[PDB]
């Protein structure tokens, strides 16, 4: 626990000061070693030492005064939900409404003043304008605008002053949880203390020693010195606790030296003890550094409220009170509202703004004196108050009278921090290194057997191997965008502190990835270059290595720029995919620079990979003569030949040559000239530098954070215009015990628990964290999977059946609903699937309307659930949860887990009122309650109080004012309950884990031996004597409803569908028009092969775009719908399949139309008289490919938990399939080992069939440079000369069969002969289609099976 600078921390800070000064030496009030030390002065000295630099004019302390502070913002309309059809018009409308609005008064004029060293607390129900006030007084006024009369002064400096010259002294923190998960607390603080060492003025101690001491004192002051070596952690990363993480925020801003602070959601997710610790850390900072700190908080504890100097109270943007915290209660008591004895003053002030919870004074209503009731009247009363006169007499008097370290040091310290991140999360780094190296080994091994010979038969494979080398080197670095997005929030926070240039963070993040890039570019390249057997000269190898290093750095900087412009990785996967396709496909291998069309030659000219690949090919081919592999006149009749009467079958060949010069081959095929060897390096370095600087400039400026109104979405159709079933049976349990085996061998978590719930009764379940409240609720609701349960649960004395889970409603604490569904649609979905099938749908609709009316939500009964930020809010989301569990007509009970937790006192009271209403309608509610107020506690009928380990201490009716419980506890030697004490806190103090957690005795024993225990046992015996289809709907009906809901999710998911379709359109149109009418020359056929190959590379983006949808539906299902027995996993998976399939078919049809015809396959079909059949088969293959991408996404996401891991696995499998497809290396040249991968990969059959359907059954038309030129023997024309050869090699043709001087010879006479080399046959098209369909079926079946394995209990 943290007690706010208590003597412990004074001693520990003296220890730290002794350490520092002894190290350095290697007035007595400030001397660590001599007696009479004062740690408070010591730390305070440091505050001066960093603030009072004679060269930095930062103020010692900033107050704040503000009068007439009005804040207004653009009115909040109802934004109709975006669907996949209406979003284009929405976009156009938004564009016209942004180029060519009425306002809402967020905050009515306010006054106030916060002096240095004071704590201000802002109270008010959500929506009252607390966040806007904090942003206004801290000058973070973006998304709204202040009035012309607003006068705000920071002890002389205007808002326009701190906004420029002192920004970072005035800080607003919407959250105190944003941190870097993998840095330890000490690392997180020492990096900041290094960036904030006034190092030009400290003498006698190394800058690092002083930074260490400063971070150590910051941990000591704020109670974190135990977490020195613990990872700061996160929600998903275990580490320090939430309270300790918020105190790390406090210590970090303390080191940063801010003077005016605002904490908006300070104690979100914190129980009273931890929230009080946080407020105590703020108080410690206030009196150690003189920092005025404002906070907005909910359910402020009285012990936490006492710490606050001043209170501001808001109501609908009106200021009802501003003054000392200890006078607010009395001020509102004079106004005419009476505080119930057991109400904390924070709760009293916040409830005075709640028409249904205020207790107006009757005495002043006897004499008929006016009491303001509406917020306008309360403000009109305050402005007339005498307290307002005092406050203004102070505010008037108050108004009438960049970085500590250089840029290089900032870069150095942030680089050290980045390395700390790397070695604290090394696993990802090792994954990158080893995955790249192993892909190197595999893919290079694929090239092992063919490069040994070194003949001219290896030229295409040399091209393709160099293509692989450059692509892999270029795109290896792309995993660091994850770290970029992970660090952006922290960079923004540290920017709002005048802590460092964001350019410094960008530059340091670039530098921290160099070691990984070099390790990869060494290991991968050594393995690949050795195995692929490129030129063995050391010089050429090192030139290759340098080119690859330049490639990786250029692409890393380009995609850092691309990621910088985007907000989330999902928003970047589309443009990044477009750039990836362009760069990869115009690199010079998929389409030689000769073959590129006039419309897209500029792409090749601006592609750094193009020049780098040119340099690589020049390096690999230049100057080495390759012996010939086969000459075109061949066989028996062609043994006696003169040199000039036979060529090599390769582009650069010359008749009579024993070899081909690689230079000629590249000049002819690619048009690369040795004079361009070093141009590629120069241009690559130019782009490296330019995009590095663009990345810095983008990270420096293009950032922002804007405010937004709480907007309901209300689907467009709406926007155009705009009883209960009694719980029937008693439920009870007896001698219930529970055990697990995970954290220990037979670790008990519920121990001899017993009790009951009856119709029309509200029973609270209480106990400190742990104590198995949620565990007991899960055990009773038959909701647990692990552990074993003994003791008997019963309904009317009979064991609970196997249909029991459908008779109980269980409202989970962390409610989760389909974010696209509306409230009414969600309720009706719940009713349609859970209520009995014999009930008509009209009756279910009527009941849903009745439930909507009961819970008071017809004002938002057609609102979209949305997210926590937009759509519904916490209160309305909890109301929807309760309604969803109610609309299933639970026969027996409604279990509620912590329905109030996380809310403010007024909405928690509204929830408790709803629960009491339901218990009055006839329901039987057993709700778990966490740290309730006395007013909330009063509403409950019965109480079941447990100790840690689920040891029941008191079961019974608590009675009025909790008097029965108080009497039971007092009558057994408990210390009495003070008349102002909350009874729940009192009983957790009597026995529990509350601060002061010592119990004079163990009260489980007292219960066991009590009178009430025997009363409970007698009643439970009498109930035992009183006793005298796993789903509600058929699997088909469940699948119908679930698939309908998923279709309504895809529709209304415009981002997913439109990213899918525009990615398909761009990628496929770009492939089609890059190879626009590629023709039927020998290079044309190869270009069409590589085009059909590029068609597949849309695999990964489509799968990754898809996976989040399944993950969302899966989270909803597993969390809520599975335990509720709403529908079976069969229905869930079949919906995930049926919905995905049609959209993928549509995408495949679009791709077919924009790919088949532009590339020219249709003319190839027509010339063969096979137009319609080949077109239909090509369209079938396109649709099958997209359906296959969907099915493989399902297969990988079925058993994987996170989407990213499933995407990585799918990418690995697709890489294997594509690499061994037989296109980058023919199976003949493949090593004997890898043929299995060439047989099992679906893309072999897909691409073989698709290229056969594209180019087969037409005549080859060799281009001028492709034709072989030689001369015939004496006296015979080339027809006679070549006739014997054509007799055997039944393919090839002569341009002039009768020519006698020199003849041009094309190897292949028909595209079928070329395809046979690729092993693609037009006779196997339908067989290959069948094989691909079987692949799709296997994917879906295996995905269903793996979901049943890894996920279904």
Q: Quick check: 775 binds ligand ADP (CB under 6 A)?
A: yes
- Count the site residues for ligand ATP by CB under 6 A: 20
Q: Quick check: 867 binds ligand ATP (CB under 6 A)?
A: no
Q: Quick check: 710 binds ligand ATP (CB under 6 A)?
A: yes
Q: Which is nearer to ligand ADP, 239 or 463 (CB)?
A: 239
For the chain, give the residues followed by a break (C–N over 2.5 Å). 26, 100, 401, 722, 1028
Chosen from ligand ATP, ligand ADP, none, partner binding at 627 (C-beta under 5 to 8 Å by type):
none
Q: Which is nearer to ligand ATP, 318 or 559 (CB)?
A: 318
Q: Quick check: 772 binds ligand ADP (CB under 6 A)?
A: yes
Of residues 650-669, those binding ligand ADP (CB under 6 A) = none
Q: How far is the CB of 767 from ligand ADP (least distance, A)?
A: 6
Positive/negative CA dihedral, 807, 813, 814, 817? positive
Q: Which is nearer to ligand ATP, 122 or 484 (CB)?
A: 122
x/- mask, ligand ADP, residues 726-745, rule CB under 6 A, reads --------------x-xx--
Q: Quick check: 814 binds ligand ADP (CB under 6 A)?
A: no
Q: Quick check: 76 binds ligand ATP (CB under 6 A)?
A: yes
Judged on CB neighbours under 10 Å (0-12, 13-18, 19+), 235 is exposed
Q: Quick check: 17 binds ligand ATP (CB under 6 A)?
A: no
Q: Quick check: 350 binds ligand ATP (CB under 6 A)?
A: no
- Provide long-range contacts, Cβ within 8 A and 24+ apart, for 1136-1142: 1136/1046, 1136/1110, 1136/1194, 1137/1191, 1137/1194, 1137/1340, 1138/1039, 1138/1043, 1139/1043, 1139/1046, 1139/1047, 1139/1049, 1139/1050, 1140/1106, 1140/1190, 1140/1193, 1140/1194, 1141/1187, 1141/1190
Q: Quick check: 721 binds ligand ADP (CB under 6 A)?
A: no
CB 1058 within 8 A of CB 84: yes
Q: Quick check: 340 binds ligand ATP (CB under 6 A)?
A: no
415: nearest Cα among 506, 531, 311: 506
Annotated binding site for ATP: 767-774
Contacts of 1033 (CB under 8 A, 6+ apart): 832, 833, 837, 1041, 1127
Among 120, 311, 749, 1063, binds ligand ADP (CB under 6 A): 749
CB-side exposure of 790: number of CA atoms within 13 Å?
A: 9
Q: How far is the CB of 296 from ligand ATP (least distance, A)?
A: 5
Among 30, 74, 603, 641, binds ligand ATP (CB under 6 A): 74
Q: Which is nearer to ligand ATP, 338 or 719 (CB)?
A: 719
Q: Quick check: 508 binds ligand ADP (CB under 6 A)?
A: no
With residue 113 as reference, give the H or E element that holds it.
strand 111-114
Chosen from ligand ATP, ligand ADP, none, partner binding at 367 (C-beta under 5 to 8 Å by type):
none
584: nearest Cα among 30, 1255, 7, 1097: 1097
- Distances in Å between the Cα of 1091 and the Cα atoms of 741, 867, 1158 are 57, 42, 12
The whole-angstrom separation of Cα 1284 and Cα 1287 is 5
Q: Quick check: 130 binds ligand ATP (CB under 6 A)?
A: yes
**382-408 burial: b if 16+ Cβ within 10 Å, else e:** beebebbeebeebbeebeeeebbbeee
Among the residue ranges 10-18, 72-80, 735-743, 1015-1023, the one whose residues contact ligand ATP (CB under 6 A):
72-80
Among the residue ranges 121-129, 321-329, 1163-1171, 1299-1307, the one whose residues contact ligand ATP (CB under 6 A):
121-129
x/- mask, ligand ATP, residues 428-457, rule CB under 6 A, reads ------------------------------
CB 587 within 8 A of CB 467: yes
Q: How far is CA 107 from the centre of its chain?
A: 33
Q: Which is nearer to ligand ADP, 34 or 769 (CB)?
A: 769
Of residues 601-640, those binding ligand ATP (CB under 6 A) = none
Neighbours of 1033 (CB within 10 A): 20
CB 761 within 8 A of CB 767: no
Chosen from ligand ATP, ligand ADP, none, partner binding at 404 (C-beta under 5 to 8 Å by type):
none
402: nearest Cα among 503, 489, 490: 503
494: nearest Cα among 141, 191, 723: 191
Q: Quick check: 785 binds ligand ADP (CB under 6 A)?
A: no
Q: Quick check: 765 binds ligand ADP (CB under 6 A)?
A: no
Q: Quick check: 272 binds ligand ADP (CB under 6 A)?
A: no
Q: How far is the CB of 1017 from ligand ADP (least distance, A)?
A: 24
The whole-angstrom separation of Cα 1262 and Cα 1267 is 6
The whole-angstrom separation of Cα 831 and Cα 838 is 12
DSSP structure string for 1268-1330: EEE---TT--HHHHHHHHHHHS---EES-TT-SS-EEEES-SBHHHHHHHHT--GGGHHHHHH
Beta bridge partners, 866, equal: 871
Among 4, 63, 73, 809, binds ligand ATP (CB under 6 A): 73
The whole-angstrom separation of Cα 303 and Cα 633 is 100
Among 262, 520, 616, 771, binds ligand ADP (CB under 6 A): 771
1253: nearest Cα among 1201, 1180, 1308, 1195: 1180
Q: Quick check: 746 binds ligand ADP (CB under 6 A)?
A: no
Chosen from ligand ADP, ligand ATP, none, partner binding at 773 (C-beta under 5 to 8 Å by type):
ligand ADP
Among the residue ranges 328-336, 705-713, 1114-1122, 1325-1333, the one whose residues contact ligand ATP (CB under 6 A):
705-713
Of residues 308-367, those binding ligand ADP (CB under 6 A) = none
Among 435, 627, 709, 959, binds ligand ATP (CB under 6 A): 709
- Count the site residues for ligand ADP by CB under 6 A: 12
**231 three-state secondary structure:** strand
Q: Which is nearer to ligand ATP, 108 or 280 (CB)?
A: 108
The whole-angstrom separation of Cα 593 and Cα 939 is 80
Sheet containing 71-74: order of strands: 103-107, 71-74, 145-146
Among the residue ranges 24-32, 186-194, 279-287, 768-776, the one whose residues contact ligand ADP (CB under 6 A):
768-776
Q: Quick check: 171 binds ligand ATP (CB under 6 A)?
A: no
Q: Quick check: 104 binds ligand ATP (CB under 6 A)?
A: yes
Q: Quick check: 375 binds ligand ATP (CB under 6 A)?
A: no
Question: Tokens representing 391?
Answer: 């406050």
**951 three-state secondary structure:** strand
Annotated binding site: 767-774
| SS3 sequence of 598-641 | HHHHHHHHCCHHHHHHHHHHHHHHCCCEEECCCECCCCHHHCCC
Chosen from ligand ADP, ligand ATP, none, partner binding at 144 (C-beta under 5 to 8 Å by type):
ligand ATP
The whole-angstrom separation of Cα 738 and Cα 734 is 12
Q: Which is nearer to ligand ADP, 430 or 786 (CB)?
A: 786
x/- mask, ligand ATP, residues 287-306, rule CB under 6 A, reads ---------x----------
Neighbours of 124 (CB within 10 A): 26
x/- mask, ligand ATP, residues 240-279, rule CB under 6 A, reads ------------------------xx--------------
Among the residue ranges 50-58, 771-779, 793-801, 1269-1277, the one whose residues contact ligand ADP (CB under 6 A):
771-779
Q: Which is nearer to ligand ADP, 777 or 1180 (CB)?
A: 777
Q: Quick check: 454 binds ligand ADP (CB under 6 A)?
A: no
Tell me which residue has its CB nearest to ligand ATP: 73
Chosen from ligand ATP, ligand ADP, none, partner binding at 771 (C-beta under 5 to 8 Å by type):
ligand ADP
Binding site for ligand ADP (CB under 6 A): 740, 742-743, 749, 769-775, 786
Binding site for ligand ATP (CB under 6 A): 73-74, 76, 104, 106, 126-132, 143-144, 264-265, 296, 707, 709-710
């Amino acid at each position: 626990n943290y007690n706010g600078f208590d003597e412990h921390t004074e001693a520990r800070i003296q220890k730290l000061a002794r350490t520092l000064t002894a190290q350095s030496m290697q007035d007595p009030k400030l001397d660590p070693n001599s007696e009479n030390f004062s740690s408070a002065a010591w730390v305070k000295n440091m505050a001066h030492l960093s603030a009072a630099d004679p060269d930095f004019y930062k103020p010692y302390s900033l107050g704040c005064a503000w009068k007439n502070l009005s804040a207004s913002g653009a009115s909040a309309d109802v934004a109709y939900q975006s669907t996949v059809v209406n979003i284009p018009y929405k976009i156009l409308k938004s564009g016209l409404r942004k180029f060519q609005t009425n306002t809402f008064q967020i905050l009515k004029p306010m006054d106030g003043c916060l002096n240095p060293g004071e704590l201000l607390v802002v109270l008010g129900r959500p929506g009252s304008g607390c966040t806007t006030l904090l942003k206004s007084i801290s000058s973070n006024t973006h998304g709204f605008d202040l009035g012309a009369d607003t006068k705000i002064s920071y002890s002389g400096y205007s808002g326009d002053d701190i906004k420029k010259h002192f920004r970072g002294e005035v800080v607003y923190n919407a959250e105190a949880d944003v941190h870097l998960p993998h840095l330890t607390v000490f690392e997180t603080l020492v990096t900041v203390a290094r960036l904030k060492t006034p190092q030009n003025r400290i003498k006698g101690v190394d800058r690092e020693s002083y930074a260490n001491h400063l971070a150590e004192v910051a941990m000591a002051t704020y109670g974190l010195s135990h977490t020195r070596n613990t990872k700061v952690g996160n929600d998903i990363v275990r580490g320090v606790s939430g309270g300790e993480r918020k105190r790390v925020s406090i210590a970090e801003v303390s080191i940063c030296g801010s003077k005016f602070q605002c904490w908006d959601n300070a104690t979100r997710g914190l129980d009273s003890a931890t929230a009080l610790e946080f407020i105590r850390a703020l108080k410690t900072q206030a009196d150690i550094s003189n920092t005025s700190a404002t906070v907005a908080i909910y359910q402020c504890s009285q012990d936490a409220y006492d710490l606050f100097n001043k209170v501001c109270v808001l109501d609908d943007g009106y200021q009802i009170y501003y003054g000392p915290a200890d006078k607010a209660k009395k001020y509102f008591e004079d106004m005419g509202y009476v505080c119930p004895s057991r109400q904390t003053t924070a709760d009293f002030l916040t409830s005075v703004t709640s028409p249904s919870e205020r207790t107006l004074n009757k005495d002043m209503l006897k004499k008929g004196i006016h009491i303001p009731q509406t917020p306008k009247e309360m403000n009109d009363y305050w402005v007339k108050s005498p307290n307002y006169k005092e406050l203004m007499k102070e505010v008037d008097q108050r108004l009438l009278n960049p970085y500590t370290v250089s840029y290089m040091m900032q870069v150095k310290y942030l680089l050290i921090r980045n390395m700390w991140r790397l070695r604290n999360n090394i696993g990802f780094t090792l994954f990158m290194i080893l995955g790249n190296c192993s892909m190197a080994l595999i893919l290079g091994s694929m090239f092992f057997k063919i490069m040994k010979k070194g003949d001219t038969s290896t030229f295409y494979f040399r091209g393709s191997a160099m293509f692989f080398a450059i692509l892999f080197n270029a795109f290896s670095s792309l995993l660091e965008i994850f770290s970029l997005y992970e660090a952006r929030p922290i960079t923004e926070k540290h920017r709002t502190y005048s802590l460092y240039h964001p350019s410094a963070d960008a530059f340091a993040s670039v530098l921290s990835e160099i070691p990984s890039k070099l390790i990869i570019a060494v290991c991968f390249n050594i393995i690949f270059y050795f195995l692929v057997d490129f030129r063995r000269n050391g010089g050429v190898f090192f030139f290759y290595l340098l080119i690859n290093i330049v490639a990786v750095f250029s692409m890393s900087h380009l995609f850092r720029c691309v990621g910088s412009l985007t907000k989330t990785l999902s928003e970047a996967m589309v443009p990044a995919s477009m750039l990836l396709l362009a760069l990869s496909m115009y690199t010079g291998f998929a389409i030689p620079k000769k073959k590129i069309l006039r419309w897209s030659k500029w792409i090749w000219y601006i592609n750094p990979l193009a020049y780098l690949f040119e340099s690589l090919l020049i390096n690999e081919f230049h100057g080495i003569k390759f012996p010939c592999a086969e000459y075109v006149p061949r066989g028996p009749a062609y043994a006696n030949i003169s040199s000039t009467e036979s060529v090599c079958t390769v582009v650069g060949a010359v008749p009579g040559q024993d070899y081909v010069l690689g230079d000629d081959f590249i000049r002819g095929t690619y048009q690369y000239y040795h004079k361009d060897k070093w141009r590629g390096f120069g241009i690559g370095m130019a782009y490296v530098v330019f995009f590095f600087f663009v990345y810095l400039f983008l990270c420096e400026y293009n950032e922002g954070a804007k405010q937004k109104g709480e907007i309901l979405v209300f689907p467009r159709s709406i926007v155009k215009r705009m009883g209960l079933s009694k719980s029937e049976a008693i439920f009870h349990w007896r001698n219930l015990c529970y055990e697990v085996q995970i954290k220990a061998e037979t670790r008990r978590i519920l121990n001899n628990v017993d009790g009951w719930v009856k119709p029309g009764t509200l029973t609270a379940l209480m106990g400190a964290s742990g104590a198995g409240k949620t565990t007991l609720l899960d055990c009773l609701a038959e909701r647990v999977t692990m552990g074993v349960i003994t003791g008997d649960i019963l309904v009317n004395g009979i064991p609970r059946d196997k249909s029991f889970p459908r008779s109980i409603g269980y409202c989970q604490q962390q409610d989760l609903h389909l974010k696209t569904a509306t409230v009414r649609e969600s309720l009706r979905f719940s009713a349609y699937l859970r209520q009995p099938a014999e009930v008509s749908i009209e009756e279910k609709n009527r009941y849903v309307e009745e439930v909507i009316k009961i819970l008071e939500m017809e004002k938002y009964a057609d609102a979209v659930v949305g997210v926590a930020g937009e759509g519904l809010n916490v209160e309305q989301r909890k109301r929807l949860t309760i309604g969803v569990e109610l609309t299933a007509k639970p026969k027996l009970l409604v279990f509620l887990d912590e329905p109030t937790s996380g809310l403010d006192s007024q909405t928690a009271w509204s929830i408790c009122q709803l629960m009491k209403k339901l218990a009055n309608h006839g329901q039987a509610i057993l709700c778990t309650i966490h740290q309730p107020s006395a007013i909330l506690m009063q509403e409950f009928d019965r109480l079941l109080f447990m100790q840690r380990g689920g040891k029941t201490v008191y079961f019974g009716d608590l009675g009025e004012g909790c008097k029965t419980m108080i009497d039971y506890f007092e009558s057994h030697g408990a210390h009495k309950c003070p008349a102002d004490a909350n009874p729940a806190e009192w009983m957790l103090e009597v026995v529990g884990a509350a601060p002061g957690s010592h119990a004079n005795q163990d009260y489980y024993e007292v219960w066991r031996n009590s009178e009430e225990y025997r009363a409970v046992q007698s009643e439970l015996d009498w109930m035992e004597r009183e006793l005298p289809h796993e789903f509600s709907q058929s699997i088909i009906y469940q699948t119908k409803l679930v698939s309908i809901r998923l279709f309504q999710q895809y529709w209304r998911s415009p981002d997913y569908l439109w990213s899918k379709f525009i990615l398909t359109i761009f990628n496929q149109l770009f492939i089609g028009f890059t190879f626009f009418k590629a023709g039927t020359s020998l290079q044309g056929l190869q270009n069409q092969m590589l085009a059909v190959f590029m068609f597949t590379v849309i695999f990964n983006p489509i799968l990754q775009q898809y996976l989040p949808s399944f993950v969302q539906q899966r989270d909803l299902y597993e969390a809520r719908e599975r335990p509720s027995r709403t529908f079976s996993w069969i229905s869930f998976i079949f919906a995930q399949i049926f919905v995905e399939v049609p959209w993928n078919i549509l995408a495949g049809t679009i791709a077919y139309f924009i790919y088949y015809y532009p590339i020219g396959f249709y003319s190839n079909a027509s010339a063969a008289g096979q137009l319609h059949e080949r077109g239909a088969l090509f369209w079938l293959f396109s649709c099958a490919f997209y359906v296959y991408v969907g099915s493989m996404g399902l297969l990988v996401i079925s058993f994987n938990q996170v989407a990213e891991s499933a995407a990585n696995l799918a990418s690995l499998l697709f890489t294997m399939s594509l690499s061994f497809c037989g296109v980058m290396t023919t199976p003949s040249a493949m090593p004997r080992f890898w043929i299995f991968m060439y047989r099992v990969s679906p893309l072999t059959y897909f691409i073989q069939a698709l290229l056969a359907v594209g180019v087969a059954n037409v005549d080859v038309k060799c281009a001028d440079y492709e034709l072989l030129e030689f001369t015939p023997p004496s006296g015979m024309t080339c027809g006679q000369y070549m006739e014997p050869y054509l007799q055997l090699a039944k393919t090839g043709y002569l341009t002039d069969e009768n020519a006698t001087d020199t003849c041009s010879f094309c190897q292949i006479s028909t595209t079928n002969d070329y395809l046979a080399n690729v092993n693609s046959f037009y006779s196997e098209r339908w067989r290959n289609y069948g094989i691909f369909i079987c692949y799709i079926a296997f994917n879906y079946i295996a995905g269903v099976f793996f979901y049943w394995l890894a996920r279904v209990p």
